Design a binder for this molecule. Sequence first.
Ligand SMILES: OC[C@H]1O[C@H](O[C@H]2[C@H](O)[C@@H](O)[C@@H](O[C@H]3[C@H](O)[C@@H](O)[C@@H](O[C@H]4[C@H](O)[C@@H](O)[C@@H](O[C@H]5[C@H](O)[C@@H](O)[C@@H](O[C@H]6[C@H](O)[C@@H](O)[C@@H](O)O[C@@H]6CO)O[C@@H]5CO)O[C@@H]4CO)O[C@@H]3CO)O[C@@H]2CO)[C@H](O)[C@@H](O)[C@@H]1O
Length: 476
Amino acid sequence: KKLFLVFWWHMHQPLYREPYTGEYLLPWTFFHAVKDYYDMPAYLKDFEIKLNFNLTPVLIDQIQEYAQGKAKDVFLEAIRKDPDDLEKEEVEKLIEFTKLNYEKPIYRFERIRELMNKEKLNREELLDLQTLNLLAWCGRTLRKDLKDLLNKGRNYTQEEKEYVLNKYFEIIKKTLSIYREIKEEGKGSVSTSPYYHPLIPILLNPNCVYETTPNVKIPDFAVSFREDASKHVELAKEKYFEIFGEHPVYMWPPEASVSNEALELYYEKGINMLATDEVILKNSVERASPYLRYYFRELISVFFRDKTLSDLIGFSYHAWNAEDAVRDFIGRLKKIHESVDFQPVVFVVLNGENCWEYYEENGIPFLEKLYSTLEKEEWIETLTLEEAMRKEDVKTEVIESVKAGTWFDGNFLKWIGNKEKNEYWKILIEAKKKAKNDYILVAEGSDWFWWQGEEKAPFVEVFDKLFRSFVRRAQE
Ligand SMILES: OC[C@H]1O[C@H](O[C@H]2[C@H](O)[C@@H](O)[C@@H](O[C@H]3[C@H](O)[C@@H](O)[C@@H](O[C@H]4[C@H](O)[C@@H](O)[C@@H](O[C@H]5[C@H](O)[C@@H](O)[C@@H](O[C@H]6[C@H](O)[C@@H](O)[C@@H](O)O[C@@H]6CO)O[C@@H]5CO)O[C@@H]4CO)O[C@@H]3CO)O[C@@H]2CO)[C@H](O)[C@@H](O)[C@@H]1O
């Protein structure tokens, strides 16, 4: 009797490319590409387990633009330049970026503490600030290859900085290839999401928010987003086809968000399986275990992730010693294994790139121990999404209805319902009446609503500039 374990790592960035200037206004796609988007699948080169990935189409677009040398990234330009060429504004940006990241374990360099305690930085000190910001985001592969430069920790030259930059772009250029490789070799399945990671249930029917939060105020949805919901799904199928040669049969619904209408739309667009959150299961069915394969109306297969296990990795284990965390995780799997006489399917689904910067050494000791341990446990069999979808020796159940929600408390309050987030929906509704191009789809991404009305910390103003620029461009 085995326990079936299914990792599904979700990779996404909203579009940071300002539509009028073409400038990438935040470097987050670059930094998570060099740190996580290649290295997370690259673990499969070293560990004989299965790991699955979701790539949003808008993230794929940006990875391609960087790989082709076409991404004009303003923060990266402040890193690349000789410090003598830095604008006062770029020095300010560098210092502000360092301050935002200063307390993260991946920024634990003594030299960074020295630099941030200095009243003024000369050219050598700025070169160190630039290069250490680069190296703080070094991924697992290059932490080995560049170990000597990493251990310097100080006294970097322009040539060394440029060497690191060149190796980083090599990683970006190999990124889509590694996803093709692990897919073709059967080491993992690759899914995608509707194109710009929107909240499909809201686009189809904004009143679905009242299934969980009856008291929420929402704006007057005087325009229909139902066709746009379809377009996000259809365009994602086309992008994922361009990159892999086939249409996707698995999708990750953004924010785990489902509703009866959304599940119908995914079924109508030929999606065979998705996953969502355990809270949605608990809200939809009186008594239901998350270790079964569910069939929604016999139309589409649904797995509900183990929320506890997913949250342990995504939010808890950064605060643990790596050995203890793996012991805890394996011990929890052992209890699931012993708690049923059938073979449970355990979905661990979370963002694949955001938690590691808070782990010691970028989560590498944790993941190397986890994967090394899992590959040796005879009673655990990790599965691709395809294997999980088709496994015969599992328990299944038909469900007829779900209560609309997301993996944030089973509801939509992170994206709608307060004055500021509702203002964004009002802006989008009015812009949709006059829309002329697909930039209206960009503006439908969940990220813009996530940051709005929170507020409040460096760069939220950048997300607001992007959202409003996309809204403006959509009407031309
Ligand atoms: O000043 C605030 C903040 O600033 C910086 O953060 C910046 C960040 O470092 C940078 O990379 C970027 O963030 C990106 C991010 O990298 C992308 O992946 C993307 O994030 C979205 C993600 O793809 C989505 O799946 C979604 O994930 C969220 C959920 O929406 C949340 O509800 C929550 O979900 C969990 C939930 O809490 C739990 O109950 C659990 O059951 O499971 C859920 C999932 O595990 O968290 C996840 C992850 O955040 O939404 C994401 C946001 O839309 O796009 C991001 C940008 O839109 O930009 C950040 C701001 O500049 C700084 O580094 C931070 O340290 C600081 O905290």
